Structure 1
Amino acid sequence: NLPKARAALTSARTTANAIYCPPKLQATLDMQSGIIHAAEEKDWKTAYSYFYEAFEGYDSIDSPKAITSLKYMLLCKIMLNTPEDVQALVSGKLALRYAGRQTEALKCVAQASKNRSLADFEKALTDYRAELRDDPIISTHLAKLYDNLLEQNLIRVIEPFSRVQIEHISSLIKLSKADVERKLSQMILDKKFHGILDQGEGVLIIFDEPPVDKTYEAALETIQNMSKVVDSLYNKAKKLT
């Protein structure tokens, strides 16, 4: 229940400064802000920073609580795939302080973030399935990943040659008409992909001529030129009568 969790988080906002010292609240409040907002899909890198700020407050607390705490933050590095904070965290003394079993399995999970590599990703997906169960939201984490990795693999095969047949290139992605080809059509709507397909002969042809410096810089000024005359129409009509 997300609205109930926000109401529970809202009650923690006024309770943080209510008593004298939290003693630890805002550290957990920022962690709770990195959960509900993570389900709200507000922002990734900032929510990942809340797991980093909470990890700084996790120093000298119950180890069974800190051994499952790295399950959330290191899998968050898997969701983002571009946190840019990788080298900062994992190279520090605080992230490497845990030598235990489960965290060593998370050490290669944090390495799997630097891995990507679909063929490797589909493999470690089964090896890390034990850590997949502790994922708070299993759908949102791996769906955006695999959907982002889709077009990451799509831009690789379409790049070398301009036009591509859609029957052979879809055999690598295992299907054509159901979803994939509709996802490539959505990339045209998002401008990430420039090209057009052919349903009859099954060939995707990429063609682009984006720049036009003659039409755009002209018509915009002519429309502005109308505003120059319309504003002068007040001078014209008033001086005559």
Structure 2
Amino acid sequence: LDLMSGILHCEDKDYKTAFSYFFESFESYHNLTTHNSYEKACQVLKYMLLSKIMLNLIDDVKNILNAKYTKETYQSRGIDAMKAVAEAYNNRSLLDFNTALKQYEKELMGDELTRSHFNALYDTLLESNLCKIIEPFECVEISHISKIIGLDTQQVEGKLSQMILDKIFYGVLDQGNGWLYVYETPNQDATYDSALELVGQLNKVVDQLFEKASVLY
């Protein structure tokens, strides 16, 4: 029940509750030992690690991997695959994640939830890598970015426009020859917003005060 509640919760992209459910299921399956207890423990380990990954927390992933009994007997090549995906997400390298997925596919395309989630994970990793390569640049060339990421110019341009519209990095794309001017985040000083809210409140105070003055008139 806990395992499948976590499974259904993962479809809602909420992972803290999913992580709690998966950890309880893993403890329950680790206590007893039947013929199918090992398989259930491995599957729930995969599910908890998958749920943990999309909310970063890579150090905690390492801690769970280095937990003694988890890596004593419950350690397996599938958990190796998932930890490789974890470290690829840590390094924020789409090439590393793609290599890990292609090499260790047998442990990851199965458990349909894992693959359906890993599609969005791939999108997130693409965005993160496009964020990392852009950080040390001001006027990077689109061709160089495509070479580094290994993607195509059109797809890179579309993804860049999508992230710019979502305000992930405050650069401005240009069609001159493939330049990607990168600008620091704007300031929008809080003093003026506070002053405007003050002005509205004082307007309302003026109307109320004049209403109070009706008895005087």
- Quick check: TM above 0.5? yes
Structure 1 counterpart of 2:205:
228
Q: What is the distance in 2 between the residues matched to 1:149 and 1:192?
A: 13
- Normalising by structure 1, we get a TM-score of 0.72
Structure 1 counterpart of 2:171:
195
Q: What is the distance in 1 between the residues matched to 2:201 and 2:71?
A: 62
Does 1:37 pair with 2:9?
yes
Provide Cα deviations, 1:39-89, integer angstroms capped at 9, x if missing partner: 232x11331221111011112232434225313432542454224642453
Matched-pair contact (CA < 8 Å) for 1:195–1:205: yes
User: Closer, same or farther in 2 for the Cα pair 1:169/1:227, shift >3 Å?
Assistant: same
Structure 2 counterpart of 1:108:
80
User: Closer, same or farther in 2 for the Cα pair 1:123/1:68, shift >3 Å?
Assistant: farther
Provide Cα deviations, 1:153-187, integer angstroms capped at 9, x if missing partner: 11221111223233432343422334x43333333
Alignment of 1:129-208 (within 5 A): 129-173=105-149, 174-178=151-155, 180-207=156-183, 208=185
1:122 to 98, 110, 130: 98
- Normalising by structure 2, we get a TM-score of 0.79
Does 1:89 pair with 2:61?
no
Letter in 2 for 1:142: F
Give unmatched runs, 5+ long, in structure 2: none
Letter in 2 for 1:217: S
Which segment is superposed worse, 208-217 or 158-167?
Answer: 208-217
2:42 to 70, 83, 96: 70
In structure 1, the residue corresponding to 2:123 is in which secondary structure? helix
1:209 to 173, 186, 191: 186
Q: What is the distance in 2 between the residues matched to 1:176 and 1:79?
A: 32
The Cα of 1:149 is off from its aligned counterpart by 1.1
User: Closer, same or farther in 2 for the Cα pair 1:157/1:90, shift >3 Å?
Assistant: closer
User: Closer, same or farther in 2 for the Cα pair 1:36/1:92, shift >3 Å?
Assistant: same
In structure 2, the residue corresponding to 1:204 is in which secondary structure? coil
Matched-pair contact (CA < 8 Å) for 2:140–2:180: yes
Q: What is the distance in 1 between the residues matched to 2:199 and 2:72?
A: 67
How many residues get paired? 207
Matched-pair contact (CA < 8 Å) for 1:79–1:144: no
Q: What is the distance in 2 between the residues matched to 1:216 and 1:153?
A: 35
Question: Which has the greater radius of gyration?
Answer: 1
Identity of matched residues, %: 34
Q: What is the distance in 1 between the residues matched to 2:145 and 2:62?
A: 36
More helix by share: 2
Give unmatched runs, 5+ long, in structure 1: 1-28
Letter in 2 for 1:186: Q
